[PDB]
Design a protein around this ligand. Structure first.
Ligand SMILES: CCCSc1cc(C(=O)O)c(O)c(I)c1-n1cccc1
Ligand SMILES: [Zn+2]
Length: 196
């Protein structure tokens, strides 16, 4: 099967937000609204904002999962490549096979789905800190888009779901991801291609 990617704000008005990091050669993570695409370096912090119109109940959680964007690959589980799954870069919580990690949250849970074999990482929802209007999760992507035997140059989407305590769907958003050495240059190139 294939997870849904349909945007769904739901009862709480759930949606993502991204910082405006620019496209300088030194940028490590940058988001293109025109492409709905995040460009990031390997294993670097990717801040993703969560926004709601109203407060969800205690026990609500936020899950992240990657799928291949192209239909002919969408049934294949997105996983780390044969090199990176063996490079012993564990943080003590993420299984070495998982592409997406959450940084700096000891309550993150990593799921290997018993039926679909897909990987995901889920955290409890926490309200914004005093003085802030949104909550930020820091993700890391642990393989390059180009990794042979893994993503192998195939584009991926990240699907972010807001879920109740049973795992039922409350909201959904998504974005394409390219993990690459020079995200600023690649964002500029792809935005230019889109304009042309
Ligand atoms: C379940 C505990 C509360 S979760 C929550 C509350 C508020 C709020 O304003 O009260 C908010 O703005 C956000 I963004 C979140 N939130 C955190 C992750 C996803 C949504
Ligand atoms: Zn890899």
């Amino acid at each position: 099967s294939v997870p849904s990617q349909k945007t769904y704000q739901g009862s709480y008005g759930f949606r993502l937000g991204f910082l405006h990091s620019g496209t300088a050669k030194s940028v490590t993570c940058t988001y293109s609204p025109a492409l709905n695409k995040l460009f990031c370096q390997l294993a670097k912090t990717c801040p993703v904002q969560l926004w709601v119109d109203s407060t969800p109940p205690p026990g609500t959680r936020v899950r992240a999962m990657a799928i291949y964007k192209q239909s002919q690959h969408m049934t294949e589980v997105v996983r780390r490549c044969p090199h990176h799954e063996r490079c012993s870069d564990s943080d003590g919580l993420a299984p070495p096979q998982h592409l997406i990690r959450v940084e700096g949250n000891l309550r993150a849970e990593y799921l290997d789905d018993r039926n679909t074999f897909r990987h995901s990482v889920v955290v409890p929802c926490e309200p914004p800190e005093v003085g802030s209007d949104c909550t930020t999760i820091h993700y890391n992507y642990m393989c390059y888009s180009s990794c042979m035997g893994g993503m192998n140059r195939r584009p991926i989407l990240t699907i972010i779901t807001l879920e109740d305590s049973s795992g039922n769907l409350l909201g959904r958003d998504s974005f394409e991801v390219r993990v690459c050495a020079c995200p600023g240059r690649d964002r500029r190139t792809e935005e230019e291609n889109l304009r042309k």
